[PDB]
Write a structure and sequence with these properties.
Order of helices and strands of chain A: HEEEEEEEEEHEHEEHEEEHEHE
Largest sheet of chain A: 5 strands, antiparallel
Oligomer: part of a larger assembly
Largest interface: A-B, 12 and 14 residues
Shape of chain A: globular
Helix content of chain A: 10-25%
Number of strands of chain A: 17
Strand content of chain A: 15-25%
Chain lengths: 309, 599, 603
């Protein structure tokens, strides 16, 4: 089927560090595969325009390790979707944690972000950079980082930020003029509150809609590499965003958060800390680090508030 | 000699349509000339600071045709002035009917409104727009009117409106992004009671003080023109305000009054040539001194009757005849709530001579149909379909005015049935059908977000709703509809030839399919008036080949479910709806699909 | 039709100032529209790779008076194209006069230049600069212009110029550090001969290929604008290059040339079509390239020609007047500059006062006088004192830009440094003084590349400037002096107003010691200029002043930071309430050798 016996084995182990290969929404020209992890759910279904948002059209099937999978014919890229999970008496609509792009259907400044079927295909031209790129050896090389918030840096018009593409040439030109080696971008992962600056993350696998599509961001990184600039991403494994449809109480129970009531209390965040005991949480988080370095050719990851961890 | 002898001869004729050149107060650097019409006066005097408000200081001299005139040295612009007319035993102070500006001395319009001597000198920069205005030629061009009350539109702070100038850039900014073609302004002529919305008029020749000076208004129109937007002014020749110092009993007797049940004794006596000068000159005054592109006459039926009033009918006919003579590219629009024929027809064919008529019949049928639940719309299908029997009787403008969103009638949003999604869906569907239906488009402010509340003039529109999804989607839908309108000429021709039925007998499923045509171009409109998606719904079409989906109301960008054909629709050569080829489509819930052949 | 009946009506009227919108090659998704002006042509055809160079494949159809128009499917952006015009028995291949980009097929320009189908789409980020630019208001603002030849300025590799893009960041960094307000570019329009410097123009609507694509130049101007620098383009309406291929005898007969018998390369301003193309090109550069200014050279050659017996070419004078009127109507904040070497009155005057309508005129009289004065040796400067003082008499007849340009640093006239007399220290001192008086003298400022460090060598277009000279101290000091001059210029408004208002003489009668004192004043603010034009230091030299009290030394040419002896007045001088030079107070100062002193009352 969608999940091989090796795939369920690694997920139970906590070793599935490429899990995006199978989790989230994976488009096929005829239809899209859906795979979501919700072990304490009695029912899970995919909802979208592709089935008149009817919950009983496509109920994913329970496989092993609490993993759910299902195929939907007619689900196509750019279609919006949502998971409908039933926990006994109660049901709730939830977003995809492995969403590869999220978008407000509304267009509104304050809006729900909806997971959208996405194709991540992109042909890279940053050959020279990655073959000569140096990580740990940079200890003996000059590293000068220009830290950036993409929306705040420059405005194309009052109150309007630059696209991933539109910023590419201006930002690369500016950084070269001042001679910085890398740019550090404040978290670009999808976040509900623009005022959070990205530290409240809902879509860890999805670049934020505000600056464009995924390919726009891949292009931005590609362009910066050809210009000889490195891209360091801010990554937030310490805590996830509090949004009701998000990672909070995913299967109707604690999943990403600590099962224990007491060791949930936390001074920095609380309730919204990742339970690193769980192999599934370890899968989700460690795969995400590799996901960005792989699919987005990122040069570095910077973790904040490690003391909180 | 202040007045030409031709002027007095023209005044007696009722042919003085430039009468504002001589009547009222006209400033000179040394002093102001005063001219007022008061035939049954024994004397008329000007009172002001320039003579300690003394009635014997400056007594005008009576000229021909009850025209009084006099010169006052030291009477200056911005000064308040007043006429004292003596009718035998009694004398009274009156305002200038031809006043070009008024302001409240107390500070409150309801206490005192005072005529102020004004200079109308203004240098225009709207040269380019007026060399290209259309109007009579606009019958075959898109006319999309944004109806506006300036005080109610936007506020700088609670209870404080924008100046004429301050509004210019925001309204011009908003109207352009929307794609609207004109702004129709609820009456700007000076009025005492703000709650009147301006329909009780005291100063026909004066723009209201509330928003600034007269030039401030000319700048606003000048500005909008440069931005390519037209200005329609609501005009009230039917009745004047009941203000004792106003037009009522001006010379001590009936003068502007008849020597209507709606406004008895406030009706203009269209028999008198003096009344006819005052009214028609004022119409031209706005087209001349303020470059206004169009004038809208309300409650025309109140003039036509009392059974028909021929005084008024000849007046309306001469009004329209005069306007197009002096301004060949102006536009006059009429609202007439009876089935009076030939409102939009030329006087030479026994018409009233208007260019446009509000299709109030359509509005009633349309609103009544959509007030109904989709479950029940089955039983009222004819109310929807039959609008097209009466849709070409006149040159019409489809109308959704302020009169429909007041007095407990409910906002357009409030009128639509069901939960919020269906309410938003219904309004997006309603507008789609209105944009497809033959006739120009008029939407009153706030309808573009589908605002919850009835129009409350004492406040500013609920712009905060533009943050929420459902209302922002409707604003996007209206903008996009307006884009389709201007881009495609199939909608420009509201003639019988322009419209062809595709199917009208699906009563059970409450669907309508129709075609809107000009020559090569076709636009196909398919409407699902029930919250049920329809699949394998075939619709006959004239042409075979690839068809595109130009617009879908149910797009998620508008707040829709998102069921769609999304373009790439290929015609199948199987006869449907008595047509050679058919389209097999998905009908979204409470939505409109607009499709054209691919090119 | 490609051409509206209004489009033909305005071309015949000479009112088609948008003609670039319709003439030339205009790309469409499946094909390019072609439009040519050829009134005396019997046939016109478009030839290209898109038709195997077939003359009968796409013959143009006349759409109006002298205009030919036609569409070619399959001609796409980046294709090279050609016009084949038939004059009876003879036909010839021609370039597009309205070509938006040209490229040499041989690889060398001088052997051949060909038209390229081009799309001019560009996304700009200079909105903020656009609203900011003063334009006419600039007369009351500081205008410092750095004159540049893009190919000659810096080379990435020996003999290889910088691209439009490659130059952007170095030039922008360079221009800000020295404080110039605009860059004036020698004609970038496509030209066959590099040695012409661009002044023999074949492609008026095409930026030269030598530095890249059209969008590359658009990027450069955009880049400079974001950095707050304006771009003035050199424009050549006086004459056109001699190319058998381009412009000359377009129809096989005279077209841009005069029908009546740089002679024969002069534009016929009588023809409505000629003014159309010329004034549209002016608007074209301001429209599509956001150019801030246009500078017209050799204006006198236009004004004159050598019953009527009139040397003034009245055609051209109306073209110039209608040129200037049109620019400011469509671009109220543009800047137009003219160099006219005759004493034609009111070059800088508005048309409605019978002026030529330029905003600025080059003060070439000043440049000549000043330079002639400063080549003379200080021993002899006594005897030529009037040449220095007399410049002010004519300093106010026009809104003027003091100008030092390539024209004066070529053809055996010698570098500015080379021009100055004496040994190396004195040469640096003399050049520091020249710039000092030039910035103090009323009028806007223009300086050509290499003058800012005092380059030894004459400007060579085949070479890059001697930037290695920036290692020598005197050259670095001259660059710093100019930097400091522009900073004072930008900050002290007493220098912004070049009218008779802003200038007052303090003393002009010291002929033996060759010293001049003058004042620059806007409203309350005043700046004092004392100039020692002799290498002999002056001690206890008194200079009358209007205000008493402490006076500050704002700039000293002789400061060591500039490479000078370091003689000076140590910051504060106290004014003595004793009369001098008809003034209530006076400052008793020390005048350093060959140095300019700028002094301010203390605030």
């Amino acid at each position: 089927s969608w999940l091989t016996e090796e795939d369920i084995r690694r997920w139970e182990s906590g070793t599935f560090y490429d899990s995006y290969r199978k989790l989230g929404a994976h488009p096929d020209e005829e239809g899209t595969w859906f795979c979501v992890w919700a072990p304490h759910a009695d029912a899970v279904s995919v909802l979208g325009a592709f089935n008149n948002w009817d919950p009983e059209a496509h109920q994913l099937e329970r496989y092993g390790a609490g993993l759910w999978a299902g195929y939907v014919p007619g689900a196509l890229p750019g279609h919006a979707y949502k998971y409908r999970i039933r926990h006994g008496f109660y049901q709730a609509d939830k977003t995809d944690p492995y969403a590869f792009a999220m978008e407000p259907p509304t267009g509104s400044p304050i809006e729900g972000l909806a997971s959208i079927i996405t194709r991540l295909d992109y042909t890279w031209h940053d050959d020279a950079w990655m073959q000569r790129r140096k990580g740990p050896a940079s200890l003996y090389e000059p590293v000068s980082i220009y830290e950036v918030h993409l929306g705040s840096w420059r405005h194309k018009q009052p109150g309007v930020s630059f696209s991933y593409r539109e910023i590419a040439e201006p930002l690369a030109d500016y950084v070269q003029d001042l001679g910085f080696t890398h740019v550090e971008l404040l978290p670009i992962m999808e976040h509900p509150y623009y005022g959070s600056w990205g530290y409240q993350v809902v879509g860890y696998y999805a670049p934020t809609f505000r600056y464009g599509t995924p390919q726009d961001l891949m292009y931005l990184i590609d362009y910066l590499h050809q210009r000889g600039i490195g891209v360091i991403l801010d990554w937030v494994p310490s805590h996830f965003a509090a949004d009701p449809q998000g990672l909070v109480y995913f299967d109707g129970t604690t999943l990403f958060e600590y099962d224990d009531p007491r060791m949930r209390h936390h001074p920095d965040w609380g309730t919204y800390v990742f339970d690193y005991n769980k192999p599934g949480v370890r899968n989700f988080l460690i795969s995400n680090a590799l996901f960005w370095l792989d699919y987005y050719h990122v040069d570095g990851l910077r973790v904040d508030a490690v003391a909180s961890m | 000699s202040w007045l030409t002898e031709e002027d007095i001869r023209r005044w007696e004729s009722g042919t003085f349509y430039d009468s504002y050149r001589k009547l009222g107060a006209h400033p000179d650097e040394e002093g102001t000339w005063f001219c007022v019409w008061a035939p049954h006066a024994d004397a008329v005097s000007v009172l002001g600071a320039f003579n300690n408000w003394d009635p014997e200081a400056h007594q005008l001299e009576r000229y021909g045709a009850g025209l009084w005139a006099g010169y006052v040295p030291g009477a200056l612009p911005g000064h308040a002035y007043k006429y004292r007319i003596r009718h035998g035993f009694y004398q009274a102070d009156k305002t200038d009917p031809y006043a070009f500006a008024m302001e409240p001395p107390t500070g409150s319009p309801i206490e005192g409104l005072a005529s102020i001597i004004t200079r109308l000198d203004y240098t225009w920069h709207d040269d380019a727009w007026m060399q290209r205005r259309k109007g009579p030629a606009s019958l075959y061009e898109p006319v999309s009117i944004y109806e506006v009350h300036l005080g109610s539109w936007r506020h700088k702070q609670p209870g404080v409106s924008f100046s004429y100038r301050e509004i210019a850039e925001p309204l011009a900014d908003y109207v352009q992004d929307l794609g609207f073609t004109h702004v129709e302004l609820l009456p700007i002529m000076e009025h005492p009671y703000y709650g009147s919305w301006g329909y009780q008029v005291v100063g026909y020749y004066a723009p209201t003080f509330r928003y600034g000076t007269p030039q401030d208004l000319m700048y606003l129109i000048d500005y909008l023109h440069q931005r390519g937007i037209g200005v329609i002014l609501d005009w009230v020749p039917s009745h004047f305000a009941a203000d004792p110092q106003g037009l009522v009993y001006f010379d001590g007797t009936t003068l502007f009054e008849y020597d209507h049940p709606d406004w008895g004794t406030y009706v203009f006596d269209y028999n008198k040539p003096g009344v006819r000068n005052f009214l028609i000159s004022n119409a031209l005054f706005w087209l001349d001194y303020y470059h206004v592109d169009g004038l809208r006459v309300d409650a025309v039926a109140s003039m036509l009757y009392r059974r028909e009033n021929l005084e008024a009918i000849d007046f309306i006919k001469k009004f329209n005849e005069t306007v197009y003579l002096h301004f060949p590219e102006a536009i006059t629009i009429a609202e007439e709530s009876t089935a009076w024929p030939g409102v939009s027809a030329p006087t030479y064919n026994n018409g009233l001579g208007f260019l446009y008529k509000w299709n109030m019949g359509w509005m009633h049928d349309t609103l009544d149909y959509m007030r109904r639940d989709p479950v029940h719309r089955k039983y009222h299908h004819d109310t929807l379909t039959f609008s097209l029997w009466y849709a070409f009787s006149e040159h019409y403008i489809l109308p959704l005015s302020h009169d429909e969103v007041v007095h407990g009638k409910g906002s357009l949003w409030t009128k639509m049935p069901g939960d919020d999604w269906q309410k938003a869906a219904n309004l997006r569907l309603l507008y789609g059908h209105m944009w497809g239906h033959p006739g120009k488009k008029l939407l009153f402010m706030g309808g573009e977000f589908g605002q919850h509340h009835e129009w409350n003039h004492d406040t500013q529109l609920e712009w905060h709703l533009l943050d929420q999804p459902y209302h922002r989607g409707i604003q996007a839908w209206v903008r996009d509809l307006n884009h389709l309108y201007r881009t495609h000429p199939a909608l420009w021709h509201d003639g019988p030839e322009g419209f062809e039925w595709i199917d009208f007998n699906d009563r059970d499923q409450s669907v309508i399919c129709y075609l809107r045509k000009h020559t090569d171009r076709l636009l196909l409109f398919v409407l699902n008036f029930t919250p049920v998606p329809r699949e394998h719904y075939r619709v006959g079409v004239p042409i075979g080949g690839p068809w595109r989906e130009v617009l879908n109301s149910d797009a998620v960008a508008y707040g829709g479910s998102g069921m769609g054909n999304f373009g790439r629709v290929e015609a199948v050569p199987e006869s449907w709806h008595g047509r050679p080829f058919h389209l097999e489509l998905t009908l979204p819930p409470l939505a409109i699909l607009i499709l054209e052949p691919e090119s």
